[PDB]
Amino acid sequence: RCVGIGNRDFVEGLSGATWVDVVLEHGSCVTTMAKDKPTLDIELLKTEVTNPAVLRKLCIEAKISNTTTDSRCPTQGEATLVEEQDTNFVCRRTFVDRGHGNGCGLFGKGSLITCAKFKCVTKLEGKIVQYENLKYSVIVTVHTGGTIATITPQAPTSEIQLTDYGALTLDCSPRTGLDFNEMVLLTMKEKSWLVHKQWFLDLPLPWTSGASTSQETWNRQDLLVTFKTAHAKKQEVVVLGSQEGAMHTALTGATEIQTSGTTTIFAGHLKCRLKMDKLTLKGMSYVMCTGSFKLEKEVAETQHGTVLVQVKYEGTDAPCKIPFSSQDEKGVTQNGRLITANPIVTDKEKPVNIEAEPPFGESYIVVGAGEKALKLSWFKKGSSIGKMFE
Amino acid sequence: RCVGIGNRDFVEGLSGATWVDVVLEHGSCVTTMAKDKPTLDIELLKTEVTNPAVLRKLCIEAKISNTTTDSRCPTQGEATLVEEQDTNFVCRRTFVDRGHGNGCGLFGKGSLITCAKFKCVTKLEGKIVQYENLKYSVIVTVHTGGTIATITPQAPTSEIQLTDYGALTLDCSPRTGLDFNEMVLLTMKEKSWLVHKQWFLDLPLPWTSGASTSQETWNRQDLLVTFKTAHAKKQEVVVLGSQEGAMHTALTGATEIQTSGTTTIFAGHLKCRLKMDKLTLKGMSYVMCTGSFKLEKEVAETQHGTVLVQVKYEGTDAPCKIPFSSQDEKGVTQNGRLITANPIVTDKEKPVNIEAEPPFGESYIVVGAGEKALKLSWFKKGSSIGKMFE
Amino acid sequence: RCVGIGNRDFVEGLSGATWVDVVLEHGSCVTTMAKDKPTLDIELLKTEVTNPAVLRKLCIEAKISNTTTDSRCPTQGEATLVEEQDTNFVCRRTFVDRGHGNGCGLFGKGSLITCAKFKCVTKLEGKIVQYENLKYSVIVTVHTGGTIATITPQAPTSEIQLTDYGALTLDCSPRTGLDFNEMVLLTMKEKSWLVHKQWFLDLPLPWTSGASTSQETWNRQDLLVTFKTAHAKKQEVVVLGSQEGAMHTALTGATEIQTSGTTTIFAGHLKCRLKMDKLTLKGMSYVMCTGSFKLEKEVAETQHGTVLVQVKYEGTDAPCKIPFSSQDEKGVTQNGRLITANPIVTDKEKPVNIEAEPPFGESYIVVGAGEKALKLSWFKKGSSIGKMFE
Ligand SMILES: *[C@H]1O[C@H](CO)[C@@H](O)[C@H](O)[C@H]1NC(C)=O
Ligand SMILES: *[C@H]1O[C@H](CO)[C@@H](O)[C@H](O)[C@H]1NC(C)=O
Ligand SMILES: *[C@H]1O[C@H](CO)[C@@H](O)[C@H](O)[C@H]1NC(C)=O
Ligand SMILES: [Cl-]
Ligand SMILES: [Cl-]
Ligand SMILES: [Cl-]
Q1: What's the CATH number where B81 sits?
Q2: Which ligand is located closest to the Cα atom of residue A85?
Q3: Contact (Cβ atoms closer than 8 angstroms) between residue C193 and residue A171
Q4: A276 to chain C nearest CA, in Å?
Q5: Same domain membership, residue C146 and residue C247
Q6: How buried is A190 (Cβ within 10 angstroms: 0-12 exposed, 13-18 middle, 19+ buried)?
Q7: Please, are residues A207 and A123 in contact by the beta-carbon 8 Å criterion?
Q8: Which among B99, B107, B387 is the nearest to C211, CB-wise?
Q9: What are phi and psi of A355, to 5 degrees?
Q10: Alpha-carbon distance B167 to B17, whole Å?
Q11: Which cysteines in this chain are paired by disulphide bridges (chains A, B, C)?
């Protein structure tokens, strides 16, 4: 089930160490073997974002109460409320017609001030992922017939004592893919999504910093509050309805994700350098597949420029290297754009996942060789930060 | 024309692979050779940013129309327009003197509301560069007397089958230089620039999100709209002129760039790891140049802390290694700050480009050795995010 | 005093080079030795941020002057000042009661406009750290009984000529820790701190871009200016007091830092690749310590997910490798989370600094082996962007 390490991915020093390159991906596992020693398997078990920090909190459903109004006759100066100085209250000033009909001696404009207590009933949260929030669990197994390493951005190294092999240093790092400098973790009610950062920051909803506070204070309350037309001595303040639906629609397309509590699981990807004592490894070679491939399921599209292609092999020469190729709208082989490190059919009955990064516009993906090749036309749209929240 | 790979930049494993480090730069090309095999050349052909996402769109020239006004006599309540609820319209409320002279029974303040339809005639766009937007074209050539690899951040690897050499893995990554987390791609009319991100975001112009929408809706329209003084029953709304000139001036200094359509060409820089089967390479050594150097052209200054120095050799010992040195305001040799990987005069008649990163403040650049050395004094100003848009 | 390089951290090529991995940390130094040659020591001397760019400037103490007011009788139209068009002035409009008592013929609302000249007396500054702002000084010493290399993000390489050893290429990069894409350099009066970026940007203080300008122009002046109640012909404008105290309190917890002039010193961390000609190095092995450890001082907590643990060894087998382990709230050994590259007691009388990255929530740190182990319970709180400025 594991892909063997080719001899192009390690060097045994005349003196010193044996250095090995391996790429760990969710599902796949990598294996190798030394001059008369047990088999060695490495595998990425999971990837977790834990306790990310809140950037802001936005309010999608507010309520109104304690509506207070103060009015003054034309010759009685400017109205005033003490809740003007209260930050839980949203206020509004104006001048209304006053006269004999409502207790005044002069027909004319009288001052009016109206304040109402704002409260966020339903809020969402945008959380930024930092180095300290990311974690990987890598399992290393010596086949005497397993040790789970913990890898993080700040702590990428993990020294482990193995049977027969000795000390093994796991020097791993996250592969280039998701960018947490750009993408943000949005959480509304129960569901969660990965959304661009500025898109979030520009959302026209009442917001409050993620900073630590005892007094939740909102900004842009007007966005959910509507001061109806004022009367001589009173004025109604109403509030917009829940904006959960308007958001769900604006989030259409944005990648949805699973998070239980303060933990969010990802499909991680690691590039690792294995350091062990001077040792002659047994490299594993794979001949190119010669048979046919069938698309076990539809070509899936990620939100950061890639596509996932799962295929099934119909040939008789497994294990073998899946021939892959990409061609722009006009039949130019790109000699690249293959993201998967180990595109190997290790088992004929097991489907093989293939990630690739098509050119922008029209193109063609090709898995297999010759006339027996699976040819698929793909259109890739320019980048976008998301859909407008209306 | 290609710089030979020194023996300090590769290791032939007792077993396993031959690993090679090479730095590809626009113009330069790197070469090496094995125990009785053809010459091998690598070269970076181009670097493209394609279909970057819009952050915001700013309006530098707006127009006004459908100016509508509604006024009310002192005793007739608050004026009102239905375009108050229309987002294409920019509105403004006030109270104007009303009386017998304009149809009213009382001399006094009458309400007034004026709305005008806002339209962006000329806009600019700020676009963020993500991993999925970057692409490199690297050509690998075996001198039997060429294969073009595609390298991207997410797909840095490229396996290629060569004649005599066999499979060759290109594991390349962008060198540290331009930071697309900080710099933004600004596009006005036809010209384009690299500008800091917050500088852009703080621009005092009407703006609209880059998010997908059918209804272009602007924010901060007031910045280009001027409500003239109101009269009893009417009020003129005028609009500022094109701000293309005010921007051109504020962009003075900002790096200008060439982009045809959705593609922007850069002068890229790659650090690459070449993986091939166990093989004894022929390292290339270069003695330090002993002759003189002339500045073919003026020392150019980049906008991210570097300077480009092109020189021409007057000596007789090419190919040779250009002696380079940097000294702060007080003659301290820095033993670094040389960005170019291969500072080699491979051809006496070809000028050699040299990138370096001077200290801040006064300093001295020195190319060549001894009394025959080219000595240049350089002042480097502290970092800035750009010039204030006035 | 230097930690010896293990044989797992270098490879001598059958042909080509000897490649060596070393991690340089403030305080520590690394050493190695070749087949009959002098000892080689490497050490990180300092890390400097120099001339970082200003993002914005915020005003914590403003003053008011040139307060000008213009009022008009009910039948005399809308007041007006020429300083309305002046950006140094903060203005405010209203309607005040006018009548016989103050020169008017009609009792009614008269227009009023008040402008005051705003000036920032005390300001702070938020500065972003870019690649061009970072610098490292690494010293390389051949023990004949030293050469200082300059390392920067854009210029990570440094070729150096050594005695007996020959040319030595320092290929160093900053270890993953502080993120200058997220953290900002705040400077108020004399003290300085590392603060999150959005926290800063959302600060409710008057602000002005860091862009180059001759005319300092502020935004959100209202935040420090208070227009008192207006009278017929006059109106006082007052200003808030210094907000240095409100900031000091909001900065509580934020890491304080030392900066003389335009330079800020950090406790840097480098991972380096040493390239030298084919050479057989003498690897250094360290047996696990068997004795006891005492906490020379209290467990310190960084603001990016780590903790610093300094211990002192009570055993008799130095130099030795400090046994380290981490366990989550329920006794699960993590097989990682150790940040320090060289956890070695090279000298019994010298305390040893140990950086580690605990899990979130409750956990246990363990230094030493067996019953002689130092067991410490640690609680790690979720990430935060800072404390609310009130
Ligand atoms: C008004 O709301 C309730 C009355 O329903 C009252 O008990 C409360 O004290 C008031 N709140 C404020 C802050 O005015
Ligand atoms: C006003 O503009 C034109 C008249 O020039 C008219 O045809 C159009 O329907 C009006 N637009 C709106 C939205 O008021
Ligand atoms: C007002 O301030 C001083 C008077 O103290 C005067 O000299 C100055 O010219 C005035 N400034 C402005 C811009 O009004
Ligand atoms: Cl009435
Ligand atoms: Cl009149
Ligand atoms: Cl009066």
Answers
A1: 3.30.387.10
A2: 1
A3: no
A4: 6
A5: no
A6: exposed
A7: no
A8: B387
A9: -95, 135
A10: 11
A11: 2-29, 59-120, 73-104, 91-115, 172-272, 289-320
Cβ atoms within 10 Å, residue B158: 25
Query: How many other C-beta atoms are found inside a 10 Å radius of the C-beta of residue A350?
Result: 14
Å from CA of A66 to ligand 1 middle: 6
Q: What residues contact A133, with CB distance under 8 A and at least 6 apart? A: A49, A50, A51, A52, A53, C305, C383
Residues C155 and C89 in one domain: no
User: Measured between alpha carbons, how far is residue C348 from residues B202, C314, C315, C322, C370 in Å?
Assistant: 56, 7, 8, 12, 19
Instruction: Give the whole-angstrom CA distance, residue C107 versus residue C100.
Output: 7
CA dist., res. B384 & res. B303, Å (int): 9
3-state secondary structure chain B: CCEECCHHHEEECCEEEEEEEEEEECCCCEEECECCCCCEEEEEEEEEEECCEEEEEEEEEEEEEEEEEEECCCCCCCCCCHHHHCCCEEEEEEEEEECHHHCCCCCEEEEEEEEEEEEEEEEEEEEECCHHHEEEEEEEEECCCCEEEEECCCCCEEEEEECCCEEEEEEEEECCCCCCCCEEEEEECCEEEEEEHHHHHCCCCCEEECCECCCCCCECHHHCEEEEEECCCCEEEEECCCCHHHHHHHCCCCEEECEECCEEEECCEEEEEEEEECCCECCCCCCECCCCEEECCCCEECCCCCEEEEEEECCCCCCEECCEEEEECCCCECCECECCCCCEECCCCCCEEEEECCCCEEEEEEECCHHHCEEEEEEECCCCCCECCC
Chain C closest CA to A171's CA: distance in Å? 11
C-alpha distance from residue A170 to each of A8, A146, A152, A165, B132 (Å): 19, 14, 11, 13, 29
Residue B82's contacts (CB-CB under 8 Å, 6 or more residues apart) are: none
What length does chain A have? 390
Residues of chain C positioned with their CB less than 8 A from the CB of A74: 97, 107-109
Residues C273, C9: contact at Cβ < 8 Å?
no
Partner residue opposite A213 with nearest CB, options C306, C338, C388: C388
DSSP per-residue string spanning A35-48: TT---EEEEEEEEE
| 3-state DSSP helix/strand/coil % of chain C, to nearest 5 | 10, 50, 40
> Which among B10, B385, B388 is the nearest to C55, CB-wise?
B385
Residue-number span of the structural domain to which A151 is assigned? 1-50+131-176+262-281
Task: Give the experimental resolution in Å.
Answer: 2.6
Cα B102 to ligand 5 centre (Å): 6
What are the tokens at A94?
């104006």
Closest by alpha carbon to C58, among C260, C211, C196, C219? C219
Contact C308, C353 (CB under 8 A): yes
- Domain tally for chain C? 4
Q: Please tell me the distance from the alpha carbon of residue A165 to that of residue A95, in angstroms, as a whole number.
A: 85
One domain, residues A37 and A150: yes
The DSSP bridge partners found for residue B361 are B380
C335 and A133 in contact by Cβ < 8 A?
no
Q: Is the CB of A198 less than 8 angstroms away from the CB of B11? A: no
Asked if C132 and B385 come within 8 Å (Cβ–Cβ), the reply is no
Residues C107 and C169 in one domain: no
**CA–CA separation, A106 vs A92, rounded Å?**
24
Amino acid in the structure at residue C26: H
- How close C258 comes to chain A (CA, Å)? 24
Say yes or no: C186 and C172 in one domain: no
What residues flank ion ligand 6 with Cβ within 5 A? C 99, 101
The ligand minimizing its distance to the Cα of B110 is: 5
Q: Are residues A28 and A147 in the same domain?
A: yes
The span from the CA of A11 to the CA of A280, in Å, is: 9
The CB density around residue C340, as the number of other CB atoms within 10 Å, is 21
Task: Among B74, B147, B212, select the one facing A384 at the smallest CB separation.
Answer: B212
